[PDB]
Every structure is written in C-alpha cells, then in structure tokens.
Amino acid sequence: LALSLTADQMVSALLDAEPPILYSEYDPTRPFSEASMMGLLTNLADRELVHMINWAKRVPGFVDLTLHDQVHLLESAWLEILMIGLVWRSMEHPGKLLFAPNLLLDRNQGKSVEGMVEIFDMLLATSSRFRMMNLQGEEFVCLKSIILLNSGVYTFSTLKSLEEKDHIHRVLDKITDTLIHLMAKAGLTLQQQHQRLAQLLLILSHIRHMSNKGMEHLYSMLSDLLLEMLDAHRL
Amino acid sequence: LALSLTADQMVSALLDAEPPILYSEYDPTRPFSEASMMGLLTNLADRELVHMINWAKRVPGFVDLTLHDQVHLLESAWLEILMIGLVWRSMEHPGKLLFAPNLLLDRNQGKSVEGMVEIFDMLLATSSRFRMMNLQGEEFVCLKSIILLNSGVYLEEKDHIHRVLDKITDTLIHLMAKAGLTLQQQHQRLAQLLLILSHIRHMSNKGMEHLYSVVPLSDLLLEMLDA
Ligand SMILES: O=C(c1ccccc1)N1[C@H](c2ccc(OC[C@@H]3CCN(CCCF)C3)cc2)c2ccc(O)cc2CC12CC2
Numbered sequence: 146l147a148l149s150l151t152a153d154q155m156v157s158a159l160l161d162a163e164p165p166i167l168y169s170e171y172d173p174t175r176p177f178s179e180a181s182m183m184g185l186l187t188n189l190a191d192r193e194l195v196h197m198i199n200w201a202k203r204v205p206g207f208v209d210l211t212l213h214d215q216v217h218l219l220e221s222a223w224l225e226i227l228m229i230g231l232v233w234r235s236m237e238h239p240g241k242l243l244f245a246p247n248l249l250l251d252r253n254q255g256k257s258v259e260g261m262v263e264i265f266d267m268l269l270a271t272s273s274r275f276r277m278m279n280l281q282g283e284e285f286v287c288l289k290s291i292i293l294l295n296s297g298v299y300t301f302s303t304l305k306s307l308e309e310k311d312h313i314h315r316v317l318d319k320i321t322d323t324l325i326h327l328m329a330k331a332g333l334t335l336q337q338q339h340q341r342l343a344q345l346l347l348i349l350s351h352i353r354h355m356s357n358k359g360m361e362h363l364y365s366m367l368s369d370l371l372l373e374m375l376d377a378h379r380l
Numbered sequence: 381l382a383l384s385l386t387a388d389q390m391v392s393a394l395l396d397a398e399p400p401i402l403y404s405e406y407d408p409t410r411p412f413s414e415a416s417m418m419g420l421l422t423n424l425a426d427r428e429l430v431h432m433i434n435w436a437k438r439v440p441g442f443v444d445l446t447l448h449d450q451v452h453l454l455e456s457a458w459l460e461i462l463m464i465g466l467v468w469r470s471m472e473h474p475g476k477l478l479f480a481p482n483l484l485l486d487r488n489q490g491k492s493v494e495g496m497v498e499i500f501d502m503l504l505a506t507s508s509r510f511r512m513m514n515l516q517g518e519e520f521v522c523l524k525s526i527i528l529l530n531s532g533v534y535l536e537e538k539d540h541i542h543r544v545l546d547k548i549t550d551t552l553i554h555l556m557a558k559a560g561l562t563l564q565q566q567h568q569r570l571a572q573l574l575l576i577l578s579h580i581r582h583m584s585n586k587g588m589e590h591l592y593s594v595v596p597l598s599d600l601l602l603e604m605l606d607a
C-alpha cells in the first residue's frame with residue numbers, strides 16, 4: 146500500500162497527517178513565570194505526544210510494522226519530532242522559540258533554567274538554518290517522517306525483524322523519491338536537487354545531537370504509555 | 381579554491397589522504413585483561429587523533445578555513461571519525477570490532493564494563509548496515525569528509541563549508557553514477573548514506589556520555605597542527 150503511493154499521494158498523506166498546533170494552558174491562576182515554565186512546557190509536550198501517536202499511525206507504512214517496532218521507533222524519535230516541530234514553528238520568529246502561539250520565548254527566558262540556553266541556542270540555530278534554506282512545509286513533513294522511521298532503525302535479528310527493517314528502508318526510499326520530486330517540481334536542477342537533499346538530511350544529524358543533549362537535560366530534572374496509545378482497540 | 385576539483389580528483393585526494401591503521405600498544409606476550417582494556421583503547425585513540433589531523437589537512441577545502449574553524453571542526457567531529465573508521469575496518473568481521481589488527485574484540489569482552497556493550501552493539505549495527513549496503517571505500521572517505529565538515533557548523537566561513545559539502549555530495553552522486561546506479565538509485569543511496577550519519581552522531585553523543593562518565597582538547601589539536 147505505502148510502497149505503491151506516488152510522490153504527490155505521499156505529500157498529500159503527510160500533509161493530511163500533520164497534527165494541530167497546540168497551545169499552552171490559559172490558567173490565570175498559573176501565570177507565566179520562571180518557576181512555572183517547565184510545568185507549562187512539560188504539559189504541552191505531553192499533549193503533543195498524544196497527537197504525535199496519531200500522526201505516526203498516518204505516516205504511510207508505519208502501521209504495517211508490529212506495534213513493538215512502532216513503540217521502539219517512537220521511543221527513539223519522539224524528542225527529535227518535538228524539536229523539529231518547534232524549529233519549524235519558530236522559523237518565522239528569529240531569535241525566539243514558538244513553543245505555542247501563546248508561548249513565544251526569547252533567549253533570556255531560557256537562562257532561568259541552568260543548562261537550558263545551550264539547547265535553546267542549538268534550536269535557534271536550526272531555525273535559522275531552515276529560514277536561510279527557505280524550508281517548505283512539504284519538505285518539513287518529509288523530514289519529520291524520515292526521523293520517525295530512521296531514528297530507531299539501527300537499534301532494534303529475527304526473520305521478522307529483517308522484514309521490518311527492509312520495509313522501513315523501502316518506505317524511507319519512497320520519502321526520498323518524494324523529497325526529490327518536490328525539488329524537481331520547484332525548478333531545482335538535478336545537481337541542486339541532490340545538494341538540497343544532502344543539506345536537509347545533514348540537518349537531521351544536528352537534530353539527533355540536540356535530542357541527545359535534550360534527553361540529558363530533561364533527565365537532569367514512556368514505553369508503556371507509547372504502547373497504550375499505539376495499542377488501540379477496534380471497538 | 382578546492383571547489384575547482386573534479387569529482388574524480390576529489391575521490392583521488394580523499395583516498396590519498398587516508399590515515400594509516402595504527403596498532404594497539406599491547407604486549408602480544410603479556411596476558412590479556414579487561415581492566416587494561418580502556419588504557420589500550422584510550423592510548424590507541426590518542427595516537428589515531430594525530431593522524432586524523434594529517435588527514436583533515438588534506439581534505440580539500442579544510443585548510444581554507446581559519447585555524448579557529450579547523451580546530452572547532454576537529455574537536456566536534458573527532459569521535460565520529462574514530463567510530464566510522466572503526467566500523468569501516470570491522471565490516472569483514474561480523475559480530476566483532478577490529479580496533480587494531482592485534483585488537484579484535486567481540487561483544488563479550490565489552491560486557492565486562494558498565495555502559496560499553498550498548499555502544500558496542502550500536503557500532504556492530506553500523507558495521508552490519510555498511511555490510512548490507514556494500515559500502516565502497518570511495519563512499520566511505522566521502523562520508524568521513526562530510527562528518528568532519530558537518531558536525532560543527534551548527535558567516536562566510538559557513539558558506540565555504542557548505543560549498544565544499546555540496547561538492548562532496550556531487551562527488552558521491554558521481555561515484556554512484558559511475559557505478560551504474562540509476563538516478564533514482566543514486567538519490568536513494570545518498571539518502572541512506574547520510575541517514576547513517578545521524579546514527580554515528582548518536583553513537584558519538586553516547587560515547588562522550590560514556591567516555592567522560594585538564595589540558596583542553598583544542599590546545600592539543602593546535603599543537604598537533606604544528607607538525
Ligand atoms: O522545555 C524544553 C527545552 C529544554 C531546553 C532547552 C530548550 C527548550 N522543551 C520542551 C519539552 C519539555 C519536556 C519534555 O518531556 C518531559 C517528559 C517527557 C514526556 N513526559 C513524560 C510523560 C508522558 F507524556 C514528561 C519534552 C519537551 C518542549 C515542549 C514542546 C515542544 O513542541 C518542544 C519542546 C522542546 C524542548 C525539548 C527541548
């Protein structure tokens with residue numbers, strides 16, 4: 146099914162799978178402050194993670210995998226997906242991170258939490274990189290889907306596992322075909338298509354680097370829950 | 381000014397720049413032990429770092445950067461380069477890591493140490509992935525050069541790095557075209573190769589988190605550049 150989609154049908158399915166932009170809580174009895182900042186950001190990420198589950202299930206080829214492999218892929222990629230969504234939202238807001246439309250934070254508000262501004266600056270630089278590249282929404286949904294399928298594919302031996310890995314790489318190839326088709330459709334020459342494809346995928350290495358640094362920072366302050374939403378019934 | 385090379389001359393320059401395969405400073409006659417296994421791997425990595433400097437100087441476009449940028453890229457990419465070099469030489473040794481011709485280890489020698497077997501397995505999975513794609517030497521040296529130039533970039537200095545990165549991308553595509561790959565197979569394989577770099581970054585982050593669980597590395601890298 147997923148391997149027979151055209152590039153336009155793959156763009157359409159990814160654009161349609163896009164989750165909504167969530168808001169920070171409008172609690173007057175909890176106004177924004179340095180103390181309540183991480184509580185608001187954690188609550189926002191928790192609500193985003195629920196929508197990330199539905200988005201993943203709508204990425205073509207994802208539900209063809211076993212849920213154990215669906216859980217592992219999302220366990221490996223969830224923070225990367227949150228960050229690239231943040232970086233995408235903040236593209237039009239230089240020097241600031243748009244966590245939510247009602248939660249636009251500048252660099253100085255990150256200094257209140259120790260260790261935050263280092264991750265803050267890396268997210269800002271990625272947003273500047275996307276801005277300088279004029280990243281398109283059709284390219285963004287492809288990059289996010291690549292992260293979902295690639296981040297955990299090297300950390301799964303059984304015959305089933307060999308079929309799953311081959312399928313993940315077959316779907317990743319079709320996203321690559323989709324990215325190139327979007328670049329050819331935009332007028333880029335073949336040399337420019339390969340060059341921009343390389344530039345976009347090399348940004349994924351930095352997003353992984355930010356994720357690892359973000360995991361150490363967050364731990365300095367999921368599997369069962371990921372399963373519970375992914376292991377839905379048909380009632 | 382290295383942007384005036386051809387794809388074939390880019391390959392030839394990177395192949396000629398390959399560092400030698402160093403040996404473990406290990407007594408082939410004294411008994412082996414796991415307590416001395418970090419000392420051998422730290423000593424080997426320190427000696428490989430010097431030859432990594434010589435290799436980086438010969439990556440086309442690297443010396444065009446300032447010494448500040450050359451050191452910053454080396455300080456940010458050195459662990460990734462050691463890892464992918466290890467993965468490259470451990471390819472024909474499935475289930476094993478060939479740190480040196482006299483230092484071949486399997487999983488069980490890594491289990492003796494807290495936190496090693498996790499990175500050991502990720503390194504083995506990368507070697508298996510290289511073995512499945514049948515990675516060529518001309519592709520491997522292009523991947524190492526991309527790691528050197530990409531691992532620290534995130535104004536005209538960044539522009540020059542991106543132009544050289546763009547040329548290595550053109551070199552990789554030219555390599556697969558000369559191999560007979562179709563245009564679809566070319567950009568598919570290029571994507572597969574560059575997506576492996578995200579896993580190598582992941583291993584480097586966990587490696588730093590592992591290895592580092594007085595003299596700054598930049599001072600040592602600067603001194604190595606004087607030879
Ligand atoms: O604050 C920060 C931040 C930190 C340092 C520098 C700059 C920014 N973050 C935010 C964040 C907080 C907690 C979290 O994870 C917390 C547990 C993990 C699941 N939770 C467990 C319970 C299961 F739901 C709790 C994930 C994300 C957040 C929110 C929304 C967004 O779009 C993006 C981000 C990005 C960022 C990830 C870097």
Ligand SMILES: O=C(c1ccccc1)N1[C@H](c2ccc(OC[C@H]3C=CN(CCCF)C3)cc2)c2ccc(O)cc2CC12CC2
Nearest residue numbers: 421422424425426429462463466479496497499500587591
């Ligand atoms: O053992 C391990 C290993 C393998 C599996 C699981 C866990 C660990 N490693 C080895 C390694 C040891 C110490 C290093 O960092 C030492 C710094 C301490 C002062 N140094 C800086 C100042 C003086 F230079 C550097 C780096 C590399 C090593 C050696 C050669 C190779 O090709 C590759 C590797 C790979 C590697 C990185 C994963």
